[PDB]
Amino acid sequence: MRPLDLTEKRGKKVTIYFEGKELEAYEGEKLPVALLANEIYWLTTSNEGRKRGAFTFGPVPMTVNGVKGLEARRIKVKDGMKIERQGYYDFHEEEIERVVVDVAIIGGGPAGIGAALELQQYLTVALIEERGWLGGDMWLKGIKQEGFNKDSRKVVEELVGKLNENTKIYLETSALGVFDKGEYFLVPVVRGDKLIEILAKRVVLATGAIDSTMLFENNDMPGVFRRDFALEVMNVWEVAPGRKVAVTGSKADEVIQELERWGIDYVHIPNVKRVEGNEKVERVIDMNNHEYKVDALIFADGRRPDINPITQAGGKLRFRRGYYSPVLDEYHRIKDGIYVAGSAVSIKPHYANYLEGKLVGAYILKEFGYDAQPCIYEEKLREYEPESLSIPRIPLDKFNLEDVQICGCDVSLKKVDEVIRKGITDLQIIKRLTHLAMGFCQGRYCLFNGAVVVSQRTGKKLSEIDLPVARSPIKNVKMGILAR
Amino acid sequence: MRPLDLTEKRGKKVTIYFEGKELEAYEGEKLPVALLANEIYWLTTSNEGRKRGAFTFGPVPMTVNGVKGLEARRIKVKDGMKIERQGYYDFHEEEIERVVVDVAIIGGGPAGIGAALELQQYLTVALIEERGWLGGDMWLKGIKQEGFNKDSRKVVEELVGKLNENTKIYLETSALGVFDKGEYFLVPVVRGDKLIEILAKRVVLATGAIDSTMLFENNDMPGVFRRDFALEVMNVWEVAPGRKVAVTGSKADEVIQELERWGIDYVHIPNVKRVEGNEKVERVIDMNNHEYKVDALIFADGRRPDINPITQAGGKLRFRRGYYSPVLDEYHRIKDGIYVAGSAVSIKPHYANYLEGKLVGAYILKEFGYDAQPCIYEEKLREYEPESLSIPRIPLDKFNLEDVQICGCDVSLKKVDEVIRKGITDLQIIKRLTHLAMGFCQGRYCLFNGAVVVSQRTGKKLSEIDLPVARSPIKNVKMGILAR
Amino acid sequence: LPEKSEIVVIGGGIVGVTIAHELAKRGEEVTVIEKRFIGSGSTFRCGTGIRQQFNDEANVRVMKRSVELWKKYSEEYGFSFKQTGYLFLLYDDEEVKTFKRNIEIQNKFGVPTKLITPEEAKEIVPLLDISEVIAASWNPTDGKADPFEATTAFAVKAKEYGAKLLEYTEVKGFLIENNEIKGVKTNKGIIKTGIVVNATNAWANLINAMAGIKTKIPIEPYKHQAVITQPIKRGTINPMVISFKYGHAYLTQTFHGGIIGGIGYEIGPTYDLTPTYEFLREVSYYFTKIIPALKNLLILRTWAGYYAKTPDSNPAIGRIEELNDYYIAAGFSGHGFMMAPAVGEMVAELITKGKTKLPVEWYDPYRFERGELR
Amino acid sequence: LPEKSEIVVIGGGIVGVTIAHELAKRGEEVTVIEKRFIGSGSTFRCGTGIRQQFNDEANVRVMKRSVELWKKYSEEYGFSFKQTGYLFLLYDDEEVKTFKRNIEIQNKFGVPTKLITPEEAKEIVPLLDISEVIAASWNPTDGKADPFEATTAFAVKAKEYGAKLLEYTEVKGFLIENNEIKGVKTNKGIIKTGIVVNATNAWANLINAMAGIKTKIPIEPYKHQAVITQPIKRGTINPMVISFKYGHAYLTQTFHGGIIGGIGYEIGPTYDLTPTYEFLREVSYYFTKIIPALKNLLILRTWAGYYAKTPDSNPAIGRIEELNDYYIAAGFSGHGFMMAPAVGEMVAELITKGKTKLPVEWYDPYRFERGELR
Numbered sequence A, B: 001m002r003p004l005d006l007t008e009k010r011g012k013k014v015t016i017y018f019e020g021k022e023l024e025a026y027e028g029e030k031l032p033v034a035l036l037a038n039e040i041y042w043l044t045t046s047n048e049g050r051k052r053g054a055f056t057f058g059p060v061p062m063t064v065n066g067v068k069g070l071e072a073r074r075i076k077v078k079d080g081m082k083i084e085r086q087g088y089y090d091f092h093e094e095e096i097e098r099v100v101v102d103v104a105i106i107g108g109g110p111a112g113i114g115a116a117l118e119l120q121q122y123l124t125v126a127l128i129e130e131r132g133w134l135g136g137d138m139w140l141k142g143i144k145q146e147g148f149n150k151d152s153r154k155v156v157e158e159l160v161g162k163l164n165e166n167t168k169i170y171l172e173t174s175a176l177g178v179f180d181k182g183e184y185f186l187v188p189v190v191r192g193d194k195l196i197e198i199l200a201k202r203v204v205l206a207t208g209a210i211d212s213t214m215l216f217e218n219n220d221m222p223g224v225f226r227r228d229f230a231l232e233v234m235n236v237w238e239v240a241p242g243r244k245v246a247v248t249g250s251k252a253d254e255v256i257q258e259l260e261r262w263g264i265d266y267v268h269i270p271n272v273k274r275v276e277g278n279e280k281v282e283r284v285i286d287m288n289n290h291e292y293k294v295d296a297l298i299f300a301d302g303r304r305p306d307i308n309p310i311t312q313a314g315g316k317l318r319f320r321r322g323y324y325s326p327v328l329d330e331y332h333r334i335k336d337g338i339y340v341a342g343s344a345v346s347i348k349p350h351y352a353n354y355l356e357g358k359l360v361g362a363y364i365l366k367e368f369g370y371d372a373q374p375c376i377y378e379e380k381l382r383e384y385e386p387e388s389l390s391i392p393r394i395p396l397d398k399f400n401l402e403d404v405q406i407c408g409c410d411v412s413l414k415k416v417d418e419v420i421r422k423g424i425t426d427l428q429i430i431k432r433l434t435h436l437a438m439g440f441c442q443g444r445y446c447l448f449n450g451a452v453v454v455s456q457r458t459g460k461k462l463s464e465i466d467l468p469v470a471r472s473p474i475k476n477v478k479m480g481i482l483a484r
Numbered sequence C, D: 001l002p003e004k005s006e007i008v009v010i011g012g013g014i015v016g017v018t019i020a021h022e023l024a025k026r027g028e029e030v031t032v033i034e035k036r037f038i039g040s041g042s043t044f045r046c047g048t049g050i051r052q053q054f055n056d057e058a059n060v061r062v063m064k065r066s067v068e069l070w071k072k073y074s075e076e077y078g079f080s081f082k083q084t085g086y087l088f089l090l091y092d093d094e095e096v097k098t099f100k101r102n103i104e105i106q107n108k109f110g111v112p113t114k115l116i117t118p119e120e121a122k123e124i125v126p127l128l129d130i131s132e133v134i135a136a137s138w139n140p141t142d143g144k145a146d147p148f149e150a151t152t153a154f155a156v157k158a159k160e161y162g163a164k165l166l167e168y169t170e171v172k173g174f175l176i177e178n179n180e181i182k183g184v185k186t187n188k189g190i191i192k193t194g195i196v197v198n199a200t201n202a203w204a205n206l207i208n209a210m211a212g213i214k215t216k217i218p219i220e221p222y223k224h225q226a227v228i229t230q231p232i233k234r235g236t237i238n239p240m241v242i243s244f245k246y247g248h249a250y251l252t253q254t255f256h257g258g259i260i261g262g263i264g265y266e267i268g269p270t271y272d273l274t275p276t277y278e279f280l281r282e283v284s285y286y287f288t289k290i291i292p293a294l295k296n297l298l299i300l301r302t303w304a305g306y307y308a309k310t311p312d313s314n315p316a317i318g319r320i321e322e323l324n325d326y327y328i329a330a331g332f333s334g335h336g337f338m339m340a341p342a343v344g345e346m347v348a349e350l351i352t353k354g355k356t357k358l359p360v361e362w363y364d365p366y367r368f369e370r371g372e373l374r
């Protein structure tokens, strides 16, 4: 057992080296998780000298066997592996498959599975998921779940269990976007390092929501965990974020329930001002200047639909219930032939998103001439009012602005605030002046916040501040993979 | 200047006596406010021995010149006045007007005024308000307001300014409910001690929202101020809640902005566990057991539509956006001939509620054959998404339950929790077993909380826990006033 | 949900549960079927009973007995029944003569009511305006109890003694073979039984209809109303005070401190609840005539409930002969709460022995078609 | 919003503002009218300029001059213009002969370009794959600058010098009296003026249409595209590297560290932006042929913008004679950012003196109807 193991691992034991030090890991574990288990948090430094971990926004470039600039999260641990830290900008110096399919479902959470289950009654589908497992956010929980009155992870197993050979599953697979060729849609997809082109008649974006990022002082430092990452390490791998854990944000109960299940000690800090520490977090300070000693901070401030795949697919947005949503016709369509389902549509219980996927799959099944009954899913859905999110009042005056990070790359809240103060309110321009939303997330974890700041400094309402649209490759792909 | 005066009062000086002590007050001031100015908070004791003030839920019975059981809030201060404390249940032992009118508007906030302004173009209306001033909640603010880009209280003056002789205003007037006689509606009304019967063809409920009550330990003790009361004493009268003030709840900024305007020092406690003190508050303790020394606590946790007048008028309810609302047809009607407008309908900016009142007045104007254009108000309204409210997770396990008060009368959270624990989930029964919602508020400040507790202990969703309806006199009336 | 039961009582109000209660402690197996919760319905909207001052032998004997059972079960199950008396205020020789006559019959059968003096009436209830009261009818062994408290108590004991009490369970029909009852059809399946008791007073007709009873048993729901004031010092108004002259007003103080009451004001055969402005005005006028201090008291709420009225204001309690093992105990016309313990006893004995100690035949189900009103 | 202005420049991109800038520092009164924000449009989507390696006298002289103005204004206003060179990679004798010939003409007019060696090309840009490059055209005084940074800079100076820059202000029509311009009609009122300059390149036709210009000045918007990679060590790729053989690829590193670039891949006359999968594939193929290390680099985003193309890839810059005081500076066909400082100078002189130092007549608006393509 390593110090942060929640279980004794029974996988094949393996040995790796971090900065020369000999560490034990298990086969199949991903680099940052093996290092966490061994109490190692600080994995890289940004170009302007900011220490960083793997469990919040931003990329983790690491030298993995003399090969510079590999992404830590993507790398499985391997016996004899030589791992080292490096600069942010340090790079290394040194057979297309075509598959035709009826629908192409992007995203493998409850919505995606839902759609696939409905669809494979008669059609051939691609279920595309970049994640390596086929649950959704649901596979991150293991707490009993409403709707299917049954344990979160047990439901996923049941559902995956029910998939046909009519469903081609694509794990560890990144969709690069959707391209309408009139007669079909092209969804180019990357798995391992092969490019696969999926030509489909229909598409469904079952694309999910992403966790909102909280603005407080060293919010990027090692040992801060965004909700999803904390749940992943605890529930998927079985590793604690730390020995004693601070928890914050408006959905902190979801996290606390997991902590309690695993018996991980914690404090609940409703309003975080700052985190401090040399390599990692060791104190958090609240808005009343109270300090708490802890090894990690976990924040959970609500999920918001990931709008990138929507807007690259050519969909339009609406602001409602504290977040941006897809504008849909009466059939959950973004545009003719592209359906949207799940937490991509709105925030609501897993079961609801599951139904919406079935709903969306049923419409296309009806399109195809099969006798489906989308409305039974429709009427089940209405039983679930979509959730709201409070819009954050960022106490700008009360923060030391250069310490609070807005995006992954450079980009402090101060830089953004500065340009707004000089009159610029158009996010298009803000994007260019500061590098907000130009980093390796494409604004996923910062655009909305940038908007909130403009809105706050301006008085201009959020339902009027329109968002820069997502462009060509919605996910990072390198570049060799795309020739010839 | 008395110690808690925010201004030097230039009204006619007067002198009163509290428990024998000689105090200075000004003419027109209401009893509890004069006593606050003179740093006196504890005004009564409940039947089970709980000390109480005037600025949260519950009645304030006081002996006012040897006459026992008069209500403090209703009594204007008068020269030579002899005021004393008394038991809760201590009582004293010792020409109907008929007015016919086209509409009868109940409630004199922006919605009511809005309706009246629209209506008096051609119709005769009664504007009924129990409050003594004709603003709404708006008259409690004096901060610049969106919509009419202009100071809150300046807008009210402008609007009242514009009222015809076609509008009979009834200040300090309590409507007892609405009674459909088919050919007209009867709205019996009490002013001073005369009963007035208003017979109207149409009615509009412009009835308002009420501030939610927060559940924490001594939430009823003297020196706790509900949002509306704190704003009233500060902005209407010009008296501070205390020299140094704790502020809590999710709408705490509204309050902080007023505090800052008046230069009243304060602390912001996001999560209150307890308040303590002998006669008054002197410390608040948070969920992490931090103490703060203060003279008062102000809580502002959101307003919710007052549903009483709605359900006594025979309207039905819907749960949405964290609160119960009236079910309306496509014309803002609860029932044929009864319109609903303002924060009675939903939570939204003052200006929106103003428009809704105009909207509602326009429909009835159209009903009457006049050429009105309700839709221009309609389309203006859509520019305003109605606000949500978070549903409170009451940390029941973390509270000492017998100290946290749910309703005005007896009724601790413990009493309610007990009966729920013994299997009872029907609020009808809870109402009867504990005396929840049987006190002199009729559940206004506790029914919803009672529901939240059931829901929390049960798992049963709030959109399924139906609410005991409001009955005969929606406001307290005594009893002599109703003979012959 | 049981599937067979020796006896099925329909309705779980004071009457229904009180009957089950007797049957169960007598060793019999009973299940009550209530469509909402135990004690919803009139029992939930009820005043505070309980009186022996009636005007005919049967009712006086039944209530004398009933009060004995209130004393017994009150302390035996710990549910609280204060014997604070009932006080009928009288204002003229007309009334005095009539009550002199009522008291006389009360006395014969062991209900020791006294005709009393205005000043005596004012000792009890000091706040009574005595100026036009010329005598009062007083009995110190009448009292008041909380109908909900008392029903729930009898309920948990009935269960303890082995009764099944079924709550969100509505009767919809009957399986009737020949003239044998075979089953009671519900919204949750059928229960096999040969003996059923209809205790649904306001709804009695509905149950009678489902049973195919062809005997005219006229029981109509009428809207009666009540008021509650703000709480007041304990023991300010102890007995139930009645004033026939001032609009059949009744008022007393609750255990909470309330002062509860209503008046005669009846609204024609309806199932409608929902209070009325006219009642609000009238009750205020009547109460403040009878005790003037009430003028300074806040009214908090008003509500409504059913009287299940018969043409002679007496219930129908008996065996219906043409359906095999059908009984009725319904139509208590405003005073069925106070009777309940005794009717429980009577119905049990009917089921159980075929006859009763008390004069149950006064409440003959057949009296109405026979033309014999009491 | 002014109501009279001596000169009105339509369009506030690099060209529009750069023209205003010259006019204003020359003492003239200018207001620019931009329908969105200063520097939106192609300037906002633009690569990083700036080149003197053209194939004819006029363009070479204009760009030589232009580069002098880039040096001057760059340091004088503090906006940053790195002279890292332009590098044309050559692969065959065909190309070598042609460039030998281009360089020759470049040299005559004071642009000291050298034909260079593969290994020399690889010293500059160490990551260049040199295996099939046989020579390269190199000029060390070509460079790159941020079009947005540079436009905003010229913008604030133009204002400082007294120019009015109107932002959310669209031109919709013209008040034309005889053949006199009298006013420019907008979405926010009319502005009186006698002299207008059309600098809206992709939109030039629209403005020409509103003006009633009957001369054929064919300028079509075409969709060109660009890619940006993840940031990389500073100074990894310094000059703009061009490869005609590999799909008219151009790539260089941004000041942020990006490596930006595009290819020839043109999409027929359209106003559509929105990138395409086919461009994504092609750029990846071409870039990785030219510098192989790019294979390991993440692509972050792709975008599109307009080339405002003419039939001979040269702008139309001149006075239109039949409308009184109408000028055009539009149709820069992909290299209008680099030209801007010089065209500013030229247009100013036209307005101001009636003729220009530089050979502005090469860009004759009338050449197309006359049949004279360059």
Ligand SMILES: Cc1cc2nc3c(=O)[nH]c(=O)nc-3n(C[C@H](O)[C@H](O)[C@H](O)COP(=O)(O)OP(=O)(O)OC[C@H]3O[C@@H](n4cnc5c(N)ncnc54)[C@H](O)[C@@H]3O)c2cc1C
Residues within 6 Å of the ligand: C010, C011, C012, C013, C014, C015, C016, C033, C034, C035, C036, C037, C039, C040, C041, C042, C043, C044, C045, C046, C047, C048, C049, C050, C169, C170, C171, C172, C199, C200, C201, C202, C203, C224, C225, C226, C262, C304, C305, C306, C307, C329, C330, C331, C332, C333, C334, C335, C336, C337, C338, C339
């Ligand atoms: C305002 C008011 C004041 C009163 N004050 C007094 C008083 O002071 N003293 C006094 O003695 N009496 C009083 N009464 C009358 C007293 O409430 C009734 O006499 C008494 O409640 C009758 O009890 P019950 O069980 O017969 O009727 P209920 O309490 O109505 O019980 C009948 C039950 O049968 C159920 N039911 C109906 N249909 C079905 C079905 N199909 N299936 C299953 N269940 C069904 C109903 O749900 C109901 O709960 C008062 C009544 C009112 C309205």
Ligand SMILES: Cc1cc2nc3c(=O)[nH]c(=O)nc-3n(C[C@H](O)[C@H](O)[C@H](O)COP(=O)(O)OP(=O)(O)OC[C@H]3O[C@@H](n4cnc5c(N)ncnc54)[C@H](O)[C@@H]3O)c2cc1C
Residues within 6 Å of the ligand: D010, D011, D012, D013, D014, D015, D016, D033, D034, D035, D036, D037, D039, D040, D041, D042, D043, D044, D045, D046, D047, D048, D049, D050, D169, D170, D171, D172, D199, D200, D201, D202, D203, D224, D225, D226, D262, D304, D305, D306, D307, D329, D330, D331, D332, D333, D334, D335, D336, D337, D338, D339
């Ligand atoms: C991908 C790409 C890369 C490029 N790379 C380079 C490069 O490396 N070097 C180089 O020199 N050039 C490059 N270019 C071309 C360069 O962007 C253009 O030549 C240059 O921006 C032209 O500037 P402009 O001011 O004439 O046009 P614009 O920048 O488009 O300005 C015209 C303005 O007129 C405005 N307008 C239009 N209609 C109206 C109206 N009715 N009223 C008011 N305003 C109106 C528009 O809003 C617009 O802002 C590149 C272009 C693209 C697309």
Ligand SMILES: Cc1cc2nc3c(=O)[nH]c(=O)nc-3n(C[C@H](O)[C@H](O)C(O)COP(=O)(O)O)c2cc1C
Residues within 6 Å of the ligand: A437, A438, A439, A468, A469, A471, D044, D045, D046, D047, D146, D147, D228, D254, D256, D258, D260, D273, D274, D300, D301, D302, D303, D304
């Ligand atoms: C010089 C230049 C540099 C750019 N750098 C980046 C970058 O570093 N990251 C990024 O995501 N986009 C970058 N872009 C693309 C911008 O997002 C660009 O303005 C754009 O995408 C146009 O907006 P649209 O895609 O919404 O139409 C750059 C564009 C230019 C012209």
Ligand SMILES: Cc1cc2nc3c(=O)[nH]c(=O)nc-3n(C[C@H](O)[C@H](O)C(O)COP(=O)(O)O)c2cc1C
Residues within 6 Å of the ligand: B437, B438, B439, B468, B469, B471, C044, C045, C046, C047, C146, C147, C228, C254, C256, C258, C260, C273, C274, C300, C301, C302, C303, C304
């Ligand atoms: C014995 C008794 C006491 C009551 N006491 C009170 C009371 O103190 N306060 C109150 O508001 N209502 C009181 N009520 C009225 C209840 O709210 C009653 O159950 C009722 O209003 C019926 O429900 P409804 O009005 O929703 O139909 C009392 C009712 C009864 C029968």
Ligand SMILES: Nc1ncnc2c1ncn2[C@@H]1O[C@H](COP(=O)(O)OP(=O)(O)OP(=O)(O)O)[C@@H](O)[C@H]1O
Residues within 6 Å of the ligand: A106, A107, A108, A109, A110, A111, A112, A128, A129, A130, A131, A135, A136, A137, A138, A173, A174, A175, A176, A177, A206, A207, A208, A209, A309, A341, A342, A343, A344, A348, A349, A350, A351, A353, A354, A474, A475
């Ligand atoms: N471009 C993409 N390529 C492949 N997978 C993607 C892409 N974008 C998003 N996804 C995946 O889509 C999945 C979204 O599932 P998620 O569980 O978040 O939402 P859901 O299925 O609507 O239901 P719920 O949100 O309730 O779990 C995630 O697993 C995410 O990795």
Ligand SMILES: Nc1ncnc2c1ncn2[C@@H]1O[C@H](COP(=O)(O)OP(=O)(O)OP(=O)(O)O)[C@@H](O)[C@H]1O
Residues within 6 Å of the ligand: B106, B107, B108, B109, B110, B111, B112, B128, B129, B130, B131, B135, B136, B137, B138, B173, B174, B175, B176, B177, B206, B207, B208, B209, B309, B341, B342, B343, B344, B348, B349, B350, B351, B353, B354, B474, B475
């Ligand atoms: N029964 C009643 N009799 C007389 N007045 C009443 C009665 N019930 C509510 N009111 C009054 O109605 C008014 C409601 O106005 P309020 O300002 O709360 O809402 P609004 O006019 O919809 O707009 P806003 O909520 O934005 O101010 C209050 O002044 C309240 O005192």
Ligand SMILES: [Cl-]
Residues within 6 Å of the ligand: C042, C201, C306, C307, C308, C309, C331, C332, C333, C334, C335, C336
């Ligand atoms: Cl009855």
Ligand SMILES: [Cl-]
Residues within 6 Å of the ligand: D042, D201, D306, D307, D308, D309, D331, D332, D333, D334, D335, D336
């Ligand atoms: Cl161009």
Ligand SMILES: [Fe+3]
Residues within 6 Å of the ligand: A407, A408, A409, A436, A437, A438, A439, A440, A441, A442, A443, A444, A446
């Ligand atoms: Fe980013």
Ligand SMILES: [Fe+3]
Residues within 6 Å of the ligand: B407, B408, B409, B436, B437, B438, B439, B440, B441, B442, B443, B444, B446
């Ligand atoms: Fe209450």
